[PDB]
Structures are given as structure tokens and as C-alpha cells.
């Protein structure tokens, strides 16, 4: 029965027992080694997890190596490592999204918003200072000519 | 004495055994089995590691499947799947922060530093070309009325 | 950020230009149809704006 | 060897094996505990994991 | 050991007990019975209660 030992006792009756799994049917039951003292681990349990953690680090395609003993470790880095993301080849498009934690959440908002907010501080020309005075080789600016 | 063999011995006097481990307190000191010939695994650690990897199997709301062999596998896969994070509407203030690569470095940026750096990227009045001739579709830009 | 449903990173560069181009000009302005002794024209002031 | 079983067999021979692991090279074979009717787990093995 | 059973286990390495119990060092050690299967309440210990 995959990871879980098969002719076992349910979670409330024992010990070190994970609770309220969640399964695809009863034919993935919770089953779990009992507490007396002789009982002996079955190997091919011992192949189920030996699997699954082989699978983890080759996540990645990353090679496993019997000599070292952090090579879950650096697979699971990897993943919360941005610094390690592929760059992209091409330029954006409006309908591009860019994760952030807005409203203290990892979510997604498309560029158009981020393009939109941009406005918020791009103020106007009523803002440029004033003088008293111009000289008459300074320059002036507007839609001149059918151009700016 | 969850997933340490609780009269075992520390990482230095063991093989195939990784050190410097920590914990919480003296509670949880690390410790391995010893090189003997008459050991045996003792379930209940068994069952702290069998708790472990189901409880992290579930992490992200799937089922657990044991016909399957690769569940931790797609659960580290789906982490690092940025495309899959939810859609957010409220638009965000420039103290709302979002995730890139700084300096070689995983980490956040205010929006309103965001906003600095483009808007400061704006260029100038004196890029824009000339004329010279005046003509009557010189719309002239000012504060007409308050109102640009 | 998921650039063409794939997950990937672009330089702040890229994103400044595509910004820059949508934010407009001069040209968009509206057209005012008469002057006020109130109003302040837009110029350079000896190399400023 | 890692977490593998040193004297195991390959996965196509038992049961609860994954097939088609990487590996470094031949100095890290995949192998797995065997169907037989009286192995045991090895506690050796038992600390890598 | 007053209320407590010496010899027992800490808050932690067992069920239904609880941590930040304030003690006087070393002389009040916080210890619990152990959910081992064949253990009894100690006698003495209820006369503390």
C-alpha cells in the first residue's frame, strides 16, 4: 500500500502517527506500525520511500550522488531560488504577469495594472518651477510642426 | 524522539551520517544507530518518518495517490511554478512589494522604489526635435486655466 | 514573472522601454482654444524646464 | 552507497521501485531492497535517509 | 518530584502534557508518563495531587 504499511492500526492508536491524511479512497488507507516492541520494518515499504525521495531530487534533473548528504537540500533550494529562473528571450506583453505579495499575498496582476499605477506618479508640466524672465535664445515647446 | 534513533549515538562516531544538525533545545538531540551487528530499525521512528513525508506530500491540497510514485515530485515542481499563483484585482499602493533577482540576490522591492526608477528614466524636454518655422498648428503647451 | 505562460525573468531595461513607449507625449494633449493673463506658458529656462 | 540498497537488485526486478533514476555514474548504482522471504532493512542504510 | 513522576518524559516527547511550565531549576524537573503500553500510574504520585 504504497508508503504506508499495509495490515497496520489506524492513526489513533498509536504513536508518531500523522493525522487527517487525506487520500484518494480507502484504497490509500492510513495504516501505520503498531507500538509493541518486537514488530520488524517490511523492506519493499522501505523501496516506496527510497522512491519518492530519489524522485524529489531529480525534480530538477538534477543527478543524485551517494557521497554527499544534503542533495534533497539543495533541490529544494533551487526551487524558492529566484536568482535561478530562466530568462526570457522575447519582450513582454501587456498580458504578461508579475507575482508580488499584494494585500500580504503571493498572487498575479498583469502588466497593464503595474502600467496603470506607473501614471499615479508621473505628474504633469503644471509642476515645473517658474521663472520671471526668458531670453531670446532660450527654447520654447509644443506640438510644433505636427510633432513635439 | 521524532526521526532520531532515541539511544543513538552522535554523527561523529556512526557512518553515512550527517552532521551538524540543529533543534530546538536538548530535546531533540540528533542521533544515528551504530555500527553494530545486532540492531534492527525500531518503528515508531519508522512511523515519524512516514508522518513526515505524508504530511508533506499534502502541502498544497492534492490527494495522495499510492498507485503513483513521484507525489513529492510534483508537489517540489509545483512550488517553483510562478505561473500558477492566483490572479489579484485590487490594484496595489507603492509600498506593495514585488519579487526579483537584485544583485544576484532572491529578495523584494517596494513598488514606490519601482516607480522612482522608471519615472526617473523619463528623459527630458530637450530631446524633443525642432522646427524652427512657426506655423499655425503650434498648439503651444501651458497651463491653460489650471488645466494643462 | 510569467512572461508567455512561462516562467522566466527580463531586465528591468525591457520593462522600462515598453513603459516608456506607452506613456505618451506633447502631442496628446488637448487643444485649449483661447489664453487667460492667469496662465503660465511651458518652456526651458536656460537649459531646465 | 548513498540510500540505496548495496546489494539490492534493479528496479525491473522487484517491487515499489522507480524506474529511471540519474545517477552521477556506475559508482552510484540504483538499487533496491529484493522481493525475497527473509531480508532485512539494513540500519546503516537507514541513517543516509 | 511533587505532582510530577520522576523518570518520565518531558512535556514534549509525550501526549496530553503542556510546556512552559515555571519550576524552580533543576530541583522541579517537569516529567510525564510515557504513552508506553504496559505502564501504571504510580501510587505515591496521587498524593501529591
Redesign the interface.
Known sequence: ?????SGGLPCTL?????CG????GD??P?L?????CN???E??????????????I??????????R??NLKA??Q??????D????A????LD????????N?????T?Q??????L???????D????GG??DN???????????
Chains 1, 2 share one sequence.
Do not use: W
Open positions: 500500500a504504497g508508503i504506508f504499511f498509536t504513536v508518531n502517527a500523522a491524511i487525506e487520500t484518494t484504497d490509500c492510513a501505520y506500525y503498531p507500538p509493541k514488530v520488524s520494518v523492506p519493499l515499504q522501505m523501496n516506496a520511500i527510497i522512491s519518492e525521495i530519489a524522485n524529489a531529480n525534480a530538477f534533473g538534477d543527478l543524485y550522488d551517494c557521497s548528504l544534503d533541490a529544494l533551487k526551487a524558492r531560488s529566484i536568482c529562473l530562466p530568462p526570457f522575447d519582450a513582454p506583453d504578461d504577469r508579475i507575482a508580488g505579495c499584494f494585500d499575498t503571493s498572487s498575479t496582476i502588466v495594472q503595474l502600467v496603470n499605477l506607473v499615479s506618479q508621473a505628474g504633469g508640466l503644471c515645473l518651477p517658474q521663472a526668458i531670453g532660450d527654447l520654447i515647446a509644443g506640438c510644433i510642426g505636427g510633432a513635439e
